[PDB]
Amino acid sequence: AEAGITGTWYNQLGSTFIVTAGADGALTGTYESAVGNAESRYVLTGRYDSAPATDGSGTALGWTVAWKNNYRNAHSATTWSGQYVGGAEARINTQWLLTSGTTEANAWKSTLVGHDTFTKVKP
Amino acid sequence: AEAGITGTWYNQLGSTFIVTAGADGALTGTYESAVGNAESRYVLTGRYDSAPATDGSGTALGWTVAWKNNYRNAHSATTWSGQYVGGAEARINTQWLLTSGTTEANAWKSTLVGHDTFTKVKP
Amino acid sequence: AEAGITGTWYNQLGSTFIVTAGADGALTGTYESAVGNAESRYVLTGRYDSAPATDGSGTALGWTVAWKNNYRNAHSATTWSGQYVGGAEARINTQWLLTSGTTEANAWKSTLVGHDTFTKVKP
Amino acid sequence: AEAGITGTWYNQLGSTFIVTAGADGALTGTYESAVGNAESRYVLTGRYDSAPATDGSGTALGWTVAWKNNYRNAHSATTWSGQYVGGAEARINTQWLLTSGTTEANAWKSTLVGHDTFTKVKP
Numbered sequence A, B, C, D: 001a002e003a004g005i006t007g008t009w010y011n012q013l014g015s016t017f018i019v020t021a022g023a024d025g026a027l028t029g030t031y032e033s034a035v036g037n038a039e040s041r042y043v044l045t046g047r048y049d050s051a052p053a054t055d056g057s058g059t060a061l062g063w064t065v066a067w068k069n070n071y072r073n074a075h076s077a078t079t080w081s082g083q084y085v086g087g088a089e090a091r092i093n094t095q096w097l098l099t100s101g102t103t104e105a106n107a108w109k110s111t112l113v114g115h116d117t118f119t120k121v122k123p
């Protein structure tokens, strides 16, 4: 975990993020887009639960990216929840929620759900 | 948003969190439990997309809480994704994902999904 | 469960559905819209797991509605997953997934997630 | 869609289901387990929205399986929501919700979320 989490990660779509896993569960870094209504780099911040593991379990973690930077303001934010598995083929398996700001009437359709798997090699 | 986000929030279950919405989209604070395998206060970190809004839309945001502090280590983390609506009865409507670290075999059952609504009054 | 499930149900939004819980776990009925890109009545089909319960537990169930009838063809379908709780104030608490048919490129944004609570009184 | 949906489907985990897509949006069949607290065959029922598509879009559909048969009664049900894509390598990409009957206190942790991709070849 932590040291093994620090570094560059890539998903299938092409998205990339660089993260630093701090000693006390913090995750800080940048996400750079590859395919959605995101463009460029965005700040990412999250947390991980280190014990984490005498039974080769994953390390739970999560992070958020608000889709606003100096070139785009998408009025939305995504949170990824999942776990880190280390080793030869270490990976972070996640499920995500993307919420867009809507009026009260359209609030029911404000959140999309999906999944992403990140690896240290692309892809 | 931001100023209106800063403060104390409560949900139905009894959970409470205090957050500070920083000038550049940051959200930092503490979450104090009321009903799950959480006990005490945990650090919370997230982001919000301010434009946010000439059509009374919500401000999208998200945050993460790793369930580890000096009294408990639950080996899990939760991410809340949703939007802030201000006014007389301001609220944050969210959907959450809670992932627990599991072995590869039990990974398919590692994530729970739910929702939470927070208000400035309890409840 | 079953007998207690059979009948008319209403949610907050105004949606209504009438269902018959058959002896062998089947759920058949119609859903009539109140607020989304649905209009009129649609066929609903699902299943419930009766044991269901010496510890006042809910009865798990789920159903699907394809948003196509003689007046509208929304190219989408919603599934509701949740449980039935009976009694004075019986209810069905659910979480739903709504998928729209998209091209491969937009598949990542094809599914919305939300929740609905149904009661026997409106609302 | 429909004809192309009828047949046998397999996912990564090993699960298999045979379905018949009826003329008027119905989906009926059986799901046979491979890895969860399911054992044997279970009845599956769902619906699909045929228009479905002058822009090679998927056909939205969904189905439910209550995990009860003559050998097991898991007190739970799963709903899969997704779309069918046909062709050389036709597939059904889905996201699922699995709800277990719980007492009111544990209702917040009653639903798991995940995804499954089914193909006509295993896997």
Ligand SMILES: N=C1N[C@H]2[C@H](CS[C@H]2CCCCC(=O)O)N1
Pocket (backbone or CB within 6 Å): A011, A013, A015, A035, A036, A037, A038, A067, A074, A076, A078, A096, A098, A114, A116, C108
């Ligand atoms: N790696 C991923 N990219 C898309 C999904 C969830 S977040 C999303 C990109 C969204 C960009 C902003 C937007 O489209 O509003 N996963």
Ligand SMILES: N=C1N[C@H]2[C@H](CS[C@H]2CCCCC(=O)O)N1
Pocket (backbone or CB within 6 Å): B011, B013, B015, B035, B036, B037, B038, B067, B074, B076, B078, B096, B098, B114, B116, D108
């Ligand atoms: N306010 C909420 N509390 C429960 C749900 C999602 S997070 C959860 C508390 C989890 C505590 C840690 C655990 O049980 O592992 N919403």
Ligand SMILES: N=C1N[C@H]2[C@H](CS[C@H]2CCCCC(=O)O)N1
Pocket (backbone or CB within 6 Å): A108, C011, C013, C015, C035, C036, C037, C038, C067, C074, C076, C078, C096, C098, C114, C116
């Ligand atoms: N009772 C509910 N109505 C909306 C949500 C999920 S299903 C949805 C109505 C969708 C209608 C069809 C469409 O908009 O495409 N819950």
Ligand SMILES: N=C1N[C@H]2[C@H](CS[C@H]2CCCCC(=O)O)N1
Pocket (backbone or CB within 6 Å): B108, D011, D013, D015, D035, D036, D037, D038, D067, D074, D076, D078, D096, D098, D114, D116
């Ligand atoms: N193909 C899949 N199998 C597991 C996930 C969601 S449904 C699940 C099997 C559950 C069996 C019943 C149970 O464990 O309670 N996808």
